Amino acid sequence: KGSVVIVGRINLSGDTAYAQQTRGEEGCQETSQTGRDKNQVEGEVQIVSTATQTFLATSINGVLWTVYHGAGTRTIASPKGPVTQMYTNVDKDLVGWQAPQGSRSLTPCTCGSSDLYLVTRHADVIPVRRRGDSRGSLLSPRPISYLKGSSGGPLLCPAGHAVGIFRAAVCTRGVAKAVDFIPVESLETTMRSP
Numbered sequence: 001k002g003s004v005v006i007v008g009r010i011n012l013s014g015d016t017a018y019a020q021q022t023r024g025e026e027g028c029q030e031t032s033q034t035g036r037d038k039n040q041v042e043g044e045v046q047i048v049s050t051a052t053q054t055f056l057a058t059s060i061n062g063v064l065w066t067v068y069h070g071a072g073t074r075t076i077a078s079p080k081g082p083v084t085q086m087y088t089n090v091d092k093d094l095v096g097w098q099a100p101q102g103s104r105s106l107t108p109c110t111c112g113s114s115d116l117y118l119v120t121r122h123a124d125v126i127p128v129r130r131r132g133d134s135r136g137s138l139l140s141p142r143p144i145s146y147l148k149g150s151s152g153g154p155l156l157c158p159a160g161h162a163v164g165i166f167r168a169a170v171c172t173r174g175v176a177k178a179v180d181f182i183p184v185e186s187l188e189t190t191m192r193s194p
């Protein structure tokens, strides 16, 4: 198992949502085997990779969360060496490490908002109608190809709180009609329990 490596970040703190790439696909492999990543971290959302796949990770409650079908059991690279996971729920498809220094956590939502926004690896923010605990409809249906590489990113309410973590797409003939996410309350349950 190599280490998960941060190769970029998305910021959600300004008047503008943007991505910024931090590591080429050559420093990634090196960082991955040694698990030592000296690069400074910033942002609420990290763009991360394993050997051939890239996806997202989201900071909430001082934990950097992502999807299990992404990270696996893997450590994540840090300035001090490889970081072992603090939380791992396979049934939930959930992984988390302690948030790296410089990673600002999103606050978990308490609004009850039904209007949501998905953040893509492209710092695109996409309108979503919450239809259940862990589902939301896309106002604009997008092709599946469009959403690939964005799992582990946040679903946000209109006040920019975290409602949950994008996990799977509900897809019909190559089109994404809706999204399934891990509710932010399941993250909190995961945090409280041995």
Ligand SMILES: C=C[C@@H]1C[C@]1(NC(=O)[C@@H]1C[C@@H](Oc2ncc(OC)c3ccc(Cl)cc23)CN1C(=O)[C@@H](NC(=O)OC(C)(C)C)C(C)(C)C)C(=O)NS(=O)(=O)C1CC1
Binding pocket: 053, 054, 055, 056, 067, 068, 069, 070, 090, 091, 092, 093, 094, 144, 145, 147, 148, 149, 150, 151, 166, 167, 168, 169, 170, 171, 180
């Ligand atoms: C289009 C972009 C979507 C968000 C995306 N995620 C996916 O591809 C997910 C992965 C897999 O689901 C799950 N795996 C493991 C689990 O635990 C170990 C799960 C435990 C509970 C549940 Cl919910 C799902 C789980 C299948 N899947 C689908 O989305 C599938 N959809 C799906 O399963 O939808 C339903 C849930 C509605 C059936 C399908 C392939 C058919 C779209 C992604 O981008 N990943 S990635 O490319 O970044 C690269 C790894 C990081």
Ligand SMILES: [Zn+2]
Binding pocket: 108, 109, 110, 111, 112, 113, 157, 158, 159, 160, 161
């Ligand atoms: Zn909210």
